[PDB]
């Protein structure tokens, strides 16, 4: 049955991770590893946020998700581990993965362990969670733990214990609320009749460029589909389409499509050329759009 | 048992690749998906055609090759499914893989799923193809696609009911020859006694100089091993050396190399160093060979 | 639930790596592949031997370990594949990885399966061993082997066979040790008091920097956690700082981090930030240290 | 006083400028050498045209410009030496520089000393001439020139003879007007009421872009200062000001001006910071202007 | 007899200085005109203050120094011309420039002319004034001025009439002390018995790294030739090396030099190796000293 | 009347070059300081060596070059004044320069101030030399010479007063000729019938390959113009072209020539293109032709 699904800061370029899934293997031995991704800039919280807070949709119920940037290794902090609540960011109107209707997934059905230092922030906020618990136990943690590897140790490790179906709530003392460390998520601002935000990401390897101001925000200003919009980045370049669904829709190759990305955030991107490289666009521009 | 191998433009820097195999435990509990590679340029369609066009005879029978760069994604385009011919000869480079005299497989063994873009051109050219069909079931595809993702909904997500055991007839209409697209292929000319090519692909991560100058174009030459050739790149870039098996042919490290690749295109190295990385060649350059 | 545990210098921008799966999958068809890295310097057989060595206490008894640089690749050589001795780096004690005291494993649990070329010098170096062959029958290797790819011939399909339960000793004839090629790893000297090593590795993505100075050879000069150290390296740029169990220990971010790595060694690096990159620090550059 | 202005694509790296000045010294002593510069791209005749087309205006009356680019070194081809009539771009009014109302300059008070490879075509189309002869006399060039090095026999050492008062018609016999070579410039075109040029150079090092978009050009389509424009360059990147004369008309540091050059081109800048650069602006991209 | 010694930010790669130059030569006939140099950092009127403080006691008396970047080129702004007082920085013990005992210059005997925009901060406060004006007469100055060139219009033009002998008293009304702008530089801390400032400079083209700790506060400090000094660099590199005279002194090429340089501020070297571009060392970070 | 021809490796970028000028023009008032170059590689000897080796011929009689790399400045060491014998033959290039027959100059009719660091080595080769001394006089080089700065006070100093009429022989005590340091030239080699060197240089900015094989090593070899030659560079990278006297005879643009600078030596380019760059081409870089 079990799956987990992996991503950490660690790299591709030695056996860190490596040694990670053997340990893995080890606990849990009829478990699936999925890489999601080992690339984050090291030690950027609010980056791994956006790798893994839209994961739960895509796997099967029953998923524990390993998640891990770990600036503070070695050190007497100790992870979290929690089961979320709703696997949507919606549920209502509920846009569940698949083919047909999609599949949809049942309430506290998948757990996050993580380092407590915000890493977890938008999971929670975008999920909910039922329980939260500190992890300490000997039996899923080592007595010595490696101080350089608590990736390795206070991650990989009781992940596949959880895997394994080891119970949540004996991993170590529940977490009060105020105990989960998060991090400040920059508001959109509502200005004028504007939308003032940032580049979230430079979408690699295409070199799209996505913001922070989501689907939501726009339906707020009355903005859809159809709508010519400016968009200015970095102060200066008031960029110039109509709102459409996707790249080919800008017409000639090199086109710019002004559009929404598969998390529902208002992007940019030129049709089947890259936008970003070309003119060193990066994350952490400021982004304005208005109609 | 069911294995799929996934070769994408996605990347390998975020969650984009994992959100497909979620889906695609999630439809095929059982299945192994292999990585082929996730690194092609965007939207390079010959370029993603020479990493899938020599796999079928190095996996089991009955594998399913979802393979994917979607410049066309979110237009009413629809992904071709076929189920290919030969395994090898075409395509045989020797013949089997494997151990002993390899590993022979059946006809009619493997099944591809790409975007109906050409990205199957040499697939078809080299193996040759029993049925294809247009993929447009809702029980294969998502009722509402994400416009920007027919990677995951057009591939990745038909590619995991077929690993499952779908019918291939069942994903839709069946696709007449002139309607699955191909790219054009330069040929290899014919200038004097010389033969005229091109740089295909500079072979990371050695910096090998990889030739659209096949085998068979040389033996066509009265070309063996043994021959003293000129082989010019860029036009005025030239290289002497025999025609050797391998690179330690080329006796003391960083000595030209003049060989046949794995797939047997005429190709060009030093012996345990980089060619192509001090030099910054590229592919695209002109390539002239003769004895 | 065999397992290969898989390192090569292949890199993953093509279908290298997937034909060698594939070719596992096929001869081993339960078998779980676990990527270690296919990043490393080709032909640096010193580097492919530090991603290898401390693996086995990580993974599964009966692990087989394909890794591979095969520069040689397409002459008479012929691969050595060896059963270990020791999992663990200690005797007594051991060391082991894993949750509560770690899981102790049984001698002669391991193989490894290699170009003859010295990658495994510190395998067998750390670990000992009980039994090396050398690897020439067809039951396990191709009767024409692709001579430009020793690495998917010569190690991957047999390696998929001894995942399989295919007997060590019938790979072929035993190898004698003098007959087991090895590199010579340069002595850490002394300078008056001052240790003298190199730089061993930049620890990517984090642009930490790993010395060859050994704990052991700290020691014998009087060095424990505490110690305030000066660590010059290139014989330029000089660093001071106690020697702490981990990163955080140096307080604001950014400040230097004199500490002993996961392997023990003497490791510089900045709290949170990258030390090597920005200041372009690179393997095998002199590194000093003293008391 | 004899004045000789020397313009080249030489560089300032070797001695190849000192021997022409030596040779410049050794021919007429009270010689002054005004470097123009010497850093042009090599070979590009239109760059050259525009590093010497408006100096007469600011150099005293007699001045003599050596102004040489020479690919066509040691061929056949011999130079061009003209008187040019105006040293304005105006007629009557003429626009002088200098304090006061500037210094008006006598009619055919300069010579020019190129190739005849069309480096002159804008000073000719600008200024007129009134004599122009083919460079051959002995007594103004080697008898035995360096093949490799024209710019130094074929127009440093005739240049040096003119400032010394050797008559201009005795440098050889009168060309004729279609014997002197020209090089077409690029037109701005008409897209709608859009304005369609290019980008003809980067201003260094400041990062300024400079259009081939005239005043005039932008006159016949309803625009001077104070008039809103929307300026896309390379068909990608957009940005708008109002037409002013200058760069703090822009208000804070960074803000973008469009404005006139020093040539009364239509230009863009960012008000004391680099635009070029940061987006990697280049010379030869479009540039589209509409009010 | 007159010269002008030229500094600005209009770089070497275009016709900008030679403009300049040629109205020099118009105004001035019998002027020479040197360069100091045209490749400081745009704008950067700290940087270009570096580059002019001091030069007077190098030049013959009677000498103007036209300094100019001017990023307020074409407003209402108007240069400032002051005679300094002294040429040197001392004058008690001379350390006059020159052969023998050095050549002692005459008070008052030495222009300037710039921006009034702070670039004559570091003269004015090195060598003090006797009178300062601002430039606005049309005797001296263009009526018509070129917005965006006021390097030209209203540096290098009137430059030219001081040089010819033009009343410094008459190119505009007397500027009282306050209307002259000025930059703060920041002070050199007198921390605890260290001293600390910052990197003022990377000295190219050798690569030596300048602090603006002056040998005056040394002297403060009782640090003279032989101190064993410990300088930081960027907060985490402590350089130790003795104060010596000069490069030499280190012993083996590529040794650390601690040293003054030749405007008597404390510098760090390597002996015949660059210290800055191998460790991408720059101007702005930290630099601190001590005993 | 006099010039001082100005080489050192003391760049443009600052104000250092400057201050030389300045005491130039201030000992000898009626002295123009013509530039060589300042952009030599930091500490080359061997480079700085070609840049000043073949100027006299081009120079009015009586000039002096100063020429200065100065890597032991503030040591005990005094620079050399040397007069040399023939301007040309040795150094002839064909013979003398200038229009028609070119300038003969007369014997002993150049002064060089240098180093006495090997800076003068292909100078005193190619040319002889009358008379050679210390610089030790405090009449020519300051009584506290700056100790970074010998450049300035034991080259620059010194050749204004020689400019200036200061008796060469008074400037200090006669040197033997072993007194004179020199540097070794590597011999162009014969292996076989091909002759073996290296890249000398670079020829920015047009890319040009500059070898140390000459004229009279290819007139040694029967080898003129019009003979075919394979010209290998970097022992891997080679070219086959005739000999020809110029670019053009290349024919299209591009095209490889093989021809001999103006100094005489074997050289290589492409036909206005640049051939270093794209292959990143370096001086140092063997270089062996053969007919
Ligand atoms: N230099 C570092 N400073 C702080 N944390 C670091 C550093 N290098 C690696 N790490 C963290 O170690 C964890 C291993 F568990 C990784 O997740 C890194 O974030
Ligand atoms: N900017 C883009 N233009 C056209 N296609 C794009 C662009 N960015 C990403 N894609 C395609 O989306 C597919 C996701 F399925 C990927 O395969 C990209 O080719
Ligand atoms: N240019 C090369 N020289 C020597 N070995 C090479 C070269 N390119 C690839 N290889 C080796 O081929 C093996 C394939 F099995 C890889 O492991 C490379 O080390
Ligand atoms: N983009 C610019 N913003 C502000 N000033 C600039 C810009 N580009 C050039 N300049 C100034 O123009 C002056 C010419 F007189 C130069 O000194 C530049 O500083
Ligand atoms: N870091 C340096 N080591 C040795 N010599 C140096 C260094 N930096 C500059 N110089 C020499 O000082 C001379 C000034 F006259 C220059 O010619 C440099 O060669
Ligand atoms: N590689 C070259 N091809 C064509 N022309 C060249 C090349 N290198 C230098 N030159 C020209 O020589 C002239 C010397 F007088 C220079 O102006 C270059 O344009």
Same mark, same amino acid.
């Given at each position: 049955?079990?799956?987990?699904?992996?991503?950490?800061?660690?790299?591709?370029?030695?056996?860190?991770?490596?040694?990670?899934?053997?340990?893995?293997?080890?606990?849990?031995?009829?478990?699936?590893?999925?890489?999601?991704?080992?690339?984050?800039?090291?030690?950027?919280?609010?980056?791994?946020?956006?790798? /893994?807070?839209?994961?739960?949709?895509?796997?099967?119920?029953?998923?524990?998700?390993?998640?891990?940037?770990?600036?503070?290794?070695?050190?007497?902090?100790?992870?979290?581990?929690?089961?979320?609540?709703?696997?949507?960011?919606?549920?209502?109107?509920?846009?569940?993965?698949?083919?047909?209707? +999609?599949?949809?997934?049942?309430?506290?059905?998948?757990?996050?362990?993580?380092?407590?230092?915000?890493?977890?922030? !938008?999971?929670?906020?975008?999920?909910?969670?039922?329980?939260?618990?500190?992890? !300490?136990?000997?039996?899923?943690?080592?007595?010595?733990?490696?101080?350089?590897?608590?990736?390795?140790?206070?991650?990989? /490790?009781?992940?596949?214990?959880?895997?394994?179906?080891?119970?949540?709530?004996?991993?170590?003392?529940?977490?009060?609320?105020?105990? /989960?460390?998060?991090?400040?998520?920059?508001?959109?601002?509502?200005?004028?009749?504007?939308?003032?935000?940032?580049?979230?990401?430079?979408?690699?390897?295409?070199?799209?460029?996505?913001?922070?101001?989501?689907?939501?925000?726009?339906?707020?200003? +009355?903005?859809?589909?159809?709508?010519?919009?400016?968009?200015?980045?970095?102060?200066?370049?008031?960029?110039?389409?109509?709102?459409?669904?996707?790249?080919?829709?800008?017409?000639?190759?090199?086109? /710019?499509?002004?559009?929404?990305?598969?998390?529902?955030?208002?992007?940019?991107?030129?049709?089947?050329?890259?936008?970003?490289?070309?003119?060193?666009?990066?994350?952490?521009?400021?982004?304005?759009?208005?109609?």
């Amino acid at each position: 049955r079990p799956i987990i699904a992996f991503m950490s800061d660690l790299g591709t370029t030695d056996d860190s991770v490596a040694q990670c899934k053997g340990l893995m293997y080890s606990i849990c031995p009829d478990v699936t590893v999925v890489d999601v991704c080992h690339s984050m800039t090291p030690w950027d919280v609010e980056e791994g946020a956006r790798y /893994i807070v839209d994961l739960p949709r895509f796997f099967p119920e029953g998923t524990v998700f390993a998640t891990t940037t770990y600036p503070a290794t070695g050190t007497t902090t100790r992870s979290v581990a929690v089961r979320i609540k709703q696997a949507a960011k919606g549920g209502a109107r509920g846009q569940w993965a698949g083919s047909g209707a +999609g599949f949809e997934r049942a309430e506290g059905s998948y757990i996050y362990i993580a380092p407590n230092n915000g890493l977890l922030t !938008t999971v929670l906020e975008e999920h909910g969670y039922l329980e939260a618990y500190e992890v !300490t136990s000997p039996k899923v943690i080592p007595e010595q733990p490696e101080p350089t590897f608590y990736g390795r140790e206070m991650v990989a /490790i009781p992940s596949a214990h959880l895997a394994a179906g080891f119970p949540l709530s004996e991993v170590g003392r529940p977490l009060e609320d105020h105990e /989960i460390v998060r991090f400040n998520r920059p508001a959109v601002e509502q200005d004028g009749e504007a939308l003032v935000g940032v580049v979230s990401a430079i979408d690699h390897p295409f070199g799209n460029v996505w913001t922070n101001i989501h689907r939501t925000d726009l339906e707020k200003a +009355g903005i859809g589909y159809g709508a010519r919009l400016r968009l200015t980045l970095d102060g200066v370049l008031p960029f110039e389409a109509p709102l459409t669904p996707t790249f080919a829709d800008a017409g000639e190759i090199g086109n /710019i499509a002004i559009y929404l990305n598969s998390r529902g955030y208002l992007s940019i991107a030129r049709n089947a050329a890259s936008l970003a490289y070309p003119y060193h666009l990066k994350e952490g521009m400021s982004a304005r759009v208005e109609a």
